[PDB]
Amino acid sequence: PTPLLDTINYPIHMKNLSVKELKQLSDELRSDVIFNVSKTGGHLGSSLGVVELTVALHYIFNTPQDKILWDVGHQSYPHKILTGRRGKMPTMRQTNGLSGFTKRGESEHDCFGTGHSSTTISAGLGMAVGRDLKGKNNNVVAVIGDGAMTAGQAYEAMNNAGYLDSDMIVILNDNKQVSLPTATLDGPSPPVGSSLFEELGLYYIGPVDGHNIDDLVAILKEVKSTRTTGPVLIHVVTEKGRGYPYAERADDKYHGVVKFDPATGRQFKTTNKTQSYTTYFAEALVAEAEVDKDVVAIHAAMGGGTGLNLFQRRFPTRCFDVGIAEQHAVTFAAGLACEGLKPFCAIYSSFMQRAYDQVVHDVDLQKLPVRFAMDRAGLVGADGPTHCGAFDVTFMACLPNMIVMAPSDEADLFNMVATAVAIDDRPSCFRYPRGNGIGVALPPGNKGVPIEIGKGRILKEGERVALLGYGSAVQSCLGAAVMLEERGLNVTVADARFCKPLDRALIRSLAKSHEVLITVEEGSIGGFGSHVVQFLALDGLLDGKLKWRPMVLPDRYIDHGAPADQLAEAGLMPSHIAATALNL
Amino acid sequence: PTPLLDTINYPIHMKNLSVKELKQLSDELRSDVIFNVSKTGGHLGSSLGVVELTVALHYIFNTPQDKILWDVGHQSYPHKILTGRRGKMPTMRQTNGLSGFTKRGESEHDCFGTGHSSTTISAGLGMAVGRDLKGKNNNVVAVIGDGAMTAGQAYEAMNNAGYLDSDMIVILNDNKQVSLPTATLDGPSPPVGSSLFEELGLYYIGPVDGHNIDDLVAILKEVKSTRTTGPVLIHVVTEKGRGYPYAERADDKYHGVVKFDPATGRQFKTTNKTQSYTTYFAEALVAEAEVDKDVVAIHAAMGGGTGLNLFQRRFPTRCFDVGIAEQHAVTFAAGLACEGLKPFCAIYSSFMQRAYDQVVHDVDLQKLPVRFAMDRAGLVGADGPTHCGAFDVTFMACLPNMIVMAPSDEADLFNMVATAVAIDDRPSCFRYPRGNGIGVALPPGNKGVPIEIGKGRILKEGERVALLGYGSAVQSCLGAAVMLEERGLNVTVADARFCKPLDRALIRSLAKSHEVLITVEEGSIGGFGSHVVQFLALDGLLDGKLKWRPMVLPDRYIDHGAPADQLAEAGLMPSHIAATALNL
Amino acid sequence: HEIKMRFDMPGLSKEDVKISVEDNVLVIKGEQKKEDSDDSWSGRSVSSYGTRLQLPDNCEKDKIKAELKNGVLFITIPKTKVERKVIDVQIQ
């Protein structure tokens, strides 16, 4: 039922269209986005409410005349549609296909590749003053939602913009305060329920209704050609999930909606055999929150993506909502960790770097007791490297006073939470991937057994060759033997779950026993492989002369797509790990 | 002339004092602080204006009854005085002595060790809700200046506080908008010149005059016992430098005042033989800013501490003031770097982690052309590890698309700026220490010769043993030979200024030529030593079997004090480097 | 301290904007709906919000400056100090 849209492949097509037909076009957009997302993994409800805006700021402002800036990129579906990427939606989020977010290095109109909240308005101000410095006379628009209004970059950049009076545009979203979040938020805590940022120096129009394209077109053409002087901010009323009567009351319930029935919203319940680690975490943390008084979890609006809703309404006063500000959290952790409490942070492995300051200074210099749950370890799969948190083992494990631990399955997951909630002399951190394993039940079913701080875990027997690693990697190390175990078990696998303090005893035993060793990790090369050889070096005076090759994330950003091929791309399908020893 | 102060060693002494004598006491405090700072290195003008407040919030609120929170800690001088640390001022900033900032791990009243701007109000809110969760009924006060009002943590934490209605106190400073900065700001750009924080939800009293202790005592006792409900923010009018008629018009000119004449303000001009690197940088950048159109430098209010005042008024439209928000800058860099410009960032090696998000995502995923000037590399000397930026080689050099360079002297400093301003296909970063060298003049005097990207630099001849390193370290490597060069020059020194892309050719040549190798760096162990062996490992198939021991910052936080002993403490005086090879 | 607020809002909608400046309470209903007449433009931009400015000092009446009701709302009204200073709310 989409007449007008089969005609447009860039805004020049629609430049002369009228508002009456503009509305029908926006409706066709709703329908097309729904039919496209019903293939896979589309952050639906935002873009559903955003179709209107996409239309407006592709009609009024020309691109790449006007450098438009969107938010994180989840609601970039209509934009991509109207920017020569309608015919590629059956390949978005797939391998070799489109990223789920705006990606500068794709098309001439892909203005600035987003992928992290609030990280845009600053670059938009930058382009604004830069074009005013090259003498050019363009318009630069930054679109964000309230979800990006909470973080720091937004506040600081927008204040500085209102200061510089650089001619630029800002666009806020979601008047009803339902957020515009990170990629993998499965669900935030549902609420039951303006800016006057002129003190910050901007101009603040809206929130106007982002549900009548007539309104917006009568704005950006009417006032905001380059005649506009200085920066302007555009809040917009947007019913997230607008256009799909299921998500219209079930937005978060269809926000990160998997391939769903376009007629009933039906989704796949096939994952009910083994649960995700994020569920395997909030399921389990309550088994320490019930038996303890001051166990508190800290999250930056990654509840669903961390499962911690199993924790919040159970203990309505030991789970805290800080918005998406990883910095304010990690100290609000330490700020509680000085009260003798044991507040413990659940924050995505990539999203930690948002706060890497406080982890370095406000905690490890204070030695305060904060345990970190670095969710979404390394390869996130179908959301692009703008979530590939393959640095956690690098930026954390370099710090003194911090303990780095990563599971192997649901058992080790909570076999360690029984430790990192036990210890409160110092901080620690959890590096658990996103996926599945083989999980014995709660410490009821014997999984909450704390283990010695700094103690490794041999998981297999093998003497001609060694093997190490942690995070999702040891499962792949288990999987690494599949083409290896049938060779007399040359391989032993040692999930040395402690990255620092390392099981310096284990590695040492591993060292002299074998003639070769191969670590592996889901992080860039500043982490386990680095620390292990750093320890291998000094301990080396007992012949640190065994071949050692850290198969880490190669120096490149692995794109979106199928996690299995991401392993194949990143050289981390077991065969890659397998081949490494095979050369020896 | 200090009658009352020889009597007080904790606020319990002054609990019954009267306001008339309170003022005289504050005056005695001004005088004592001046006589103490005239020994060394005191961040004077703030604390000079802060004496009043220190008095008030040590009189009203009891400690450790009430967890008071100061700003970065520069104006902690009066606080320390009134907290059993008046008699230690002749040892503050020295080795084994006091830190120039509040340090939680020192005294029972040292509430939360600050050292980075805006990193406090969050921890203050944390303590507030925590004490309300332990049932305790205390008061938690956070004191900050406008200098901490700009950054992100402040905005986000204070919004979240106004949300949680947790009973807490916030204190803003410096009504006249003269800032409260980072430690080593030698001078900001001097300016010629109501704060609605109700949208942030808190309560905002002030700015009242922080120059009559009568005013403040009639406030915190009058309304802000625990009867106060929710969070409150206290702006205060404070003439920075109050009490010293020189700094009263020369605050920044006596802010980071070296041991000065308490009668005339005279300071030591003895440093006019060799200039600092920060001067050696802005002196030199203009030699590329004159011959180029879009060379722009970016700084977060570290002008004096980066010398970039040699750059600002020269090019009043190619140097930008962003406040102290390292995040908003590093993209405002990239946001300009997409306009084909070449905007280049000068930000302290420690203060980068404040923004490590954007360097990871908003730049290296965009491959935008931003060059970083990581000032204050590693050992900052007399300001404590709350500035020890010994992670820059770790968190940066792990990224793809980023080039890491560090000088050896003023020559290599600008021999590379001629490169990192030349290249704009990608980002890069400068790791220069704080100190001195041996500097030939500007590219006029032949120092602006660009060098091949990824090319090392052998600085000495030596074949039985190798040696590497960069930053301040290669000078120490030069200095390392002083007890080594007289041994037949076993040592060669190779300032392989490129950390990534490494001079993979040099290291390889170095490898087979020698039988031993020793890198060294001013960073924690996630950097050069890691990357070099990571490259040593894969290249190792040509016998990566040479002994290699990265003498990096040991896993500990090196305190304030004399830089030479910091080298001795951190195991980085040449003898330590010397001893390493001596074992072989 | 003293109370101040300006509304840049070029083309401040003529739907509902209000000003009331008492002691430490203040209601500053700054609003840009654009629900029918954007500024004079065609738009069904259904919107809902108003502005609140309480004050952490009972706003006395020494100096008042106001420029408002068409495109801006801007008010400045004073006080300084003590007796239960709260803004945006007086929580129990």
Author numbering:
A (entry chain 13), B (entry chain 11): 73 to 265, 318 to 708
C (entry chain 12): 136 to 227
Excerpt from the paper describing this PDB structure:
In this work, we study Hsp21, a chloroplast-localized sHsp in all photosynthesizing plants that plays a critical role in chloroplast development, fruit maturation, thermomemory regulation and protection of the photosynthetic complex during heat stress. DXPS catalyzes the first and rate-limiting step of the methylerythritol 4-phosphate (MEP) pathway responsible for the synthesis of metabolic precursors for isoprenoids in plants. Here we show the formation of a stable complex between Arabidopsis thaliana plastid sHsp, Hsp21, and its natural substrate 1-deoxy-D-xylulose 5-phosphate synthase (DXPS) under heat stress, and report cryo-electron microscopy structures of Hsp21, DXPS and Hsp21-DXPS complex at near-atomic resolution.
Here we succeed in obtaining the Hsp21-DXPS complex by co-expression of both Hsp21 and DXPS in E. coli at 37 °C under conditions that promote thermally induced aggregation of DXPS and soluble complex formation, and determining its structure by cryo-EM. At least three intermolecular contacts contributing to the Hsp21-DXPS interaction are revealed from the structure. The first interface lies between the β5-β7 loop connecting β5 and β7 strands of the ACD of Hsp21 and residues 335–348 within domain I of one DXPS monomer containing an α-helix. The second interface involves the interaction of the CTR of Hsp21 with a surface patch on domain I near the dimer interface on the opposite DXPS monomer. The final interface is defined by the interaction between the hydrophobic groove of the ACD of Hsp21 and residues 318–322 within the mobile loops of the DXPS. The map permitted the construction of a model of the ACD with seven β strands (denoted as β2- β9, with β6 missing in our structure), in striking contrast to the six-stranded ACD structure identified in the Hsp21-DXPS complex, suggesting that the ACD partly unfolds to peel away the first β strand (β2) during its interaction with DXPS.
